[PDB]
Amino acid sequence: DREKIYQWINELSSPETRENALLELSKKRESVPDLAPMLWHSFGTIAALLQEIVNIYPSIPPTLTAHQSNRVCNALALLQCVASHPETRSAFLAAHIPLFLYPFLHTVSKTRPFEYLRLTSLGVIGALVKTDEQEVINFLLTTEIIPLCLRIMESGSELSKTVATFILQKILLDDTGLAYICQTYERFSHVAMILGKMVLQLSKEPSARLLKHVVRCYLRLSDNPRAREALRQCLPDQLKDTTFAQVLKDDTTTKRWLAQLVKNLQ
């Protein structure tokens, strides 16, 4: 596998062999555990994945085709592999690699090629926050991903909403993330206002997974005393009434989180 990896890495340099090498290296992410440092330390490799991404910035009127999106999504998945490896993560953050994905989190395009990109880019960020490492939490705080997550949570696909809510949740769950969001009223209210709108949309178009993650964000906010005092007055009716009785019928975890949340507010 190692010899194939170096050949494919080299084959990224000619445009006739480039796509096939991207797809082949991507297939090795599930089976070669050292693939991330191999990619990170091979001269030019990261630069070649980043080139795939910036080459579609001009495609954001939206002109991205499915072929173009599938190719970049494999570059993104290779970068997710690098984000996930303990030996390469700190340098990925030190090189600000995440900032390259933010245009894909930011576009409002509704085409399916931009949905595949948005989901894979959220996947890269989600792989970082899944580590719960402070370094990751503080980097994302300083780089303004929360406004990007909020806009996606507010009007993305159900699956995009879920991953973005998960990212915001992992930041809320950290003590520094919770303190940061509750440090000013404008920060806290932007998050709570977004969560309230989502609760209203969910009442019309229910999703159990998305409701669970929304409820986790509310539960965690009530650990902060100023957020607790605001949610005493503004917690959506729909989290206390029969709005989600049908959807919660089998979810013991969310019902227990909602009970804990109401108890917290007193």
Binding site: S26, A66, S84, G123, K130, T162
Partner: peptide, 28 residues
């Protein structure tokens, strides 16, 4: 726009695979 060619299927399967690594459907 409902049309799907091979690249649509591939990209969707890949996004789902990537996101299934996150454990969004875990129950505490």
């Amino acid at each position: 726009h409902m049309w799907e060619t091979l690249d649509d299927q591939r990209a969707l399967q890949l996004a789902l695979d990537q996101l299934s690594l996150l454990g969004l459907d875990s129950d505490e």
